């Protein structure tokens, strides 16, 4: 039948998860636990096993088929992703589950280390019991975020995943830490008025008491994403500053943090820094899990780069092959370059609704300073002494006098750097025609030397950690 074919792969899924739990339980093996847990296992569990072969009715077959309700409720947790009490909360195509025929296979392998017989479910006290429970939830959450489940299922995730846990450990908190972040993205997507932020805050207190590196990193990045949606600026600003955000973090974590920090910085008139992190973020983000947030980074970033006075290329639009969705941003790119306001104001209002979703709209209005700035910027840098009159004819500014105030303000900001001599009336470039007399070639090299040294210190410590973890746990 249909669940028999995918049965081979369920034993495979169980092999990787069971081991992962095992590792965690013996002291601090933390580094090896987080790489396994996130993009690597997940890309396989969902896509290869369930979707590709077909049969998504192997997910609540995986976390139940014994009839475990667990000593602290998690029976519901398993239902809601798939097979609510009917055939499919998305895709069924299963003739055996725990509400169709109990048992057909054991991914549970008759030992508490993912799942185990009903004897655990009704009551246990074992030290294997928290370890299976935290783990139980990671396995479930994997289909939730990929398939983009919604509704009530989304609302009840939070309850089971935290306020059943307020005591964990470092091993357990790490697993839970990953589960909360995936649910949080699924939550964000629906654009429900029911507070995403509130749960994520409650989860933070538990993260902090165990003092688990992982818990702080995951929650914090999501908490910023939540904050942007509501559009309550002050809290996110403080929260970003508090995040130390560890150097030993998963790839998806790295791309998402830089991305949030960029959104926050862009409105602020810290656009030079915002644009670098946002460009980086797109590259760093994967091909599979990342896709919802990923879209949003490329759309926002095009506006953010303009804010610095960068003129973004056509290759940028064509190459990921999203050019259609990007088409309006493309229009802003043209408008910024020309130096004339009329085209920029018109586009801002017309696409206004579409921009607001992505969270661009607050950044779009800031470009009005930038429309003129980007055009005066090319002209001031290129030439030496040029008249305000040249700037105004080319750019289509109102007056040379108008153009004179505008250049003055920019040199104060210092992203065009010049000194104006309104005698004859030219704007003058800064330039020394030798930078060897100045420290600047040395200072440039020296900065690299600090940046380089950081890589050496990071590498020596990181290198031994996974083989060490493997030694205690025993390797074949």
């Amino acid at each position: 039948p249909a669940p028999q074919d995918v049965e081979m792969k369920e034993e495979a899924a169980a092999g990787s998860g069971s081991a992962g739990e095992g590792d965690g339980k013996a002291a601090a093996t933390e580094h090896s636990q987080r790489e396994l847990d996130t993009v690597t296992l997940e890309d396989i569990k969902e896509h290869v096993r369930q979707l590709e072969k077909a049969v998504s009715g192997k997910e609540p077959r995986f976390v139940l088929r014994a009839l475990r309700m667990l000593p602290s409720t998690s029976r519901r947790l398993n239902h809601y992703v798939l097979y609510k009490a009917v055939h499919g909360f998305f895709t069924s195509n299963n003739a055996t589950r725990d509400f169709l025929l109990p048992f057909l296979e054991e991914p549970m392998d008759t030992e508490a280390d993912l799942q185990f017989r009903p004897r655990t479910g009704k009551a246990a006290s074992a030290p294997l019991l928290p370890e299976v429970e935290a783990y139980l939830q990671l396995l479930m959450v994997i289909f939730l975020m990929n398939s983009k489940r919604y509704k009530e299922a989304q609302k009840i995730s939070d309850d089971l995943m935290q306020k059943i846990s307020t005591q964990n450990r470092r091993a357990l908190d790490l697993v839970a830490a990953k589960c909360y972040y995936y649910h949080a993205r699924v939550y964000e997507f629906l654009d429900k008025l029911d507070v995403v932020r509130s749960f994520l805050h409650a989860r933070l207190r538990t993260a902090t008491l165990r003092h688990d590196a992982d818990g702080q990193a995951t929650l914090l990045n999501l908490l910023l994403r939540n904050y942007l949606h509501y559009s309550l600026y002050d809290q996110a600003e403080k929260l970003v500053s508090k995040s130390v955000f560890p150097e030993q973090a998963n790839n998806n974590e790295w791309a998402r943090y830089l991305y949030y920090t960029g959104r926050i910085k862009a409105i602020q008139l810290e656009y030079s820094e915002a644009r670098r992190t946002m460009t980086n973020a797109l590259r760093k983000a994967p091909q599979h899990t990342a896709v919802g947030f990923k879209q949003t980074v490329h759309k926002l970033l095009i506006v953010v780069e303009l804010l610095l006075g960068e003129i973004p290329d056509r290759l940028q639009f064509r190459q990921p092959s999203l050019k259609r969705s990007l088409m309006p941003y493309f229009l802003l790119t043209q408008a910024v370059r020309t130096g004339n306001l009329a085209k920029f104001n018109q586009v801002l209002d017309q696409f206004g609704e579409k921009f607001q979703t992505d969270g661009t709209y607050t950044l779009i209005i800031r470009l009005r300073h930038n429309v003129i700035k980007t055009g005066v910027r090319m002209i001031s840098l290129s030439y030496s002494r040029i008249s305000l009159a040249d700037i105004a004819q080319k750019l289509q500014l109102d007056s040379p006098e108008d153009a004179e105030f505008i250049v003055a303000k920019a040199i104060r900001d210092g992203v065009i750097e010049a000194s104006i001599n309104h005698e004859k009336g030219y704007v003058q470039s800064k330039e020394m025609i030798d930078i060897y007399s100045t420290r600047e070639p040395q200072l440039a090299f020296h900065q690299r030397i600090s940046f380089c040294l950081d890589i050496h210190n990071m590498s020596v410590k990181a290198m031994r950690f996974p083989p060490k973890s493997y030694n205690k746990d025993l390797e074949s």
């Binding site: 607050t362 009005r368 104060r412 000194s419 200072l443």
Partner: protein
């Protein structure tokens, strides 16, 4: 007792023209905080029950704040406003939505400019969404005005669009004809290494020596037609030095220490 509808509620008389005094409204708000206690304790947690309570909580606070601008009690307005901000942002379908909501938002926005914190405007604007929950009409005047000042225009800035609302936005303009002047003047300090007095006064929009003196003090500029625009330009030039190595090279101690550990 309250500030609610009907003239039997004591602050309401002050909101209307029954008490013409601008400072007896603001004054009377202090008493009103005691009556506020009961009406603001319940709706600081959102529920549809708490919808009747919300309206009244806001009424006392908004009315008091509005009247303060007229007589330039403005710092006191900004602390009163804060409470209003949270109610306008949220508490959806329990009636934050009013004529009062609109007026109040625009008043606050205007104030950030009066302090000359460009930065403060952008964060604040986004916080309330104070540009799509009552829309840019009256609200338009501070938003466009802040965009123009940031841009560096001191010729499409507007003050005429702030007299389209006369909902006590009309008293903020008074102190925003100061601010436009302030900004031109700072930019001019950066602008010139040194230029003629004559060329610089027509752009200041000063043309009497008294006006020159007044803002010159703030700038640090000495005398009236005479001024030293040059201070700001002078700062750029020290990159030329090389003779004292210790600071100029920089991080000499830092790079060495880490390097020694590694090998």
């Amino acid at each position: 007792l309250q500030a609610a509808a009907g003239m039997y509620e004591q602050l309401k008389d002050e909101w209307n023209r029954k008490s013409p005094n601008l400072s007896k409204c603001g004054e009377e708000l202090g008493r009103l905080k005691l009556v506020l206690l009961e009406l603001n304790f319940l709706p600081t947690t959102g529920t549809k029950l708490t919808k009747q309570q919300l309206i009244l909580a806001r009424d006392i606070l908004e009315i008091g704040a509005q009247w303060s601008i007229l007589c330039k009690d403005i710092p006191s307005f900004e602390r009163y406003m804060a409470q209003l901000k949270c109610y306008y942002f949220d508490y959806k379908e329990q009636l934050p939505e009013s004529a009062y909501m609109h007026q109040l938002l625009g008043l606050n926005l205007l104030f950030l400019l009066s302090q000359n914190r460009v930065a403060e405007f952008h964060t604040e604007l986004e916080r309330l969404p104070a540009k799509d929950i009552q829309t840019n009409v009256y609200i338009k005047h501070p938003v466009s005005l802040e965009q123009y000042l940031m841009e560096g225009s001191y010729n499409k800035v507007f003050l005429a669009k702030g007299n389209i609302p006369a909902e006590s936005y009309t008293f903020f303009i008074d102190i925003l004809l100061d601010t436009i002047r302030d900004e031109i003047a700072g930019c001019i300090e950066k602008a010139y290494e040194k230029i003629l007095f004559a060329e610089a006064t027509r752009i200041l929009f000063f043309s009497t020596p008294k006006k020159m003196t007044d803002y010159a003090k703030k700038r640090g500029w000495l005398l009236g037609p005479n001024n030293y625009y040059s201070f700001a330009s002078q700062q750029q030039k020290p990159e030329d030095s090389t003779i004292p190595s210790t600071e100029l090279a920089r991080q000499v101690i830092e790079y060495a220490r880490q390097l020694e550990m590694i090998v």
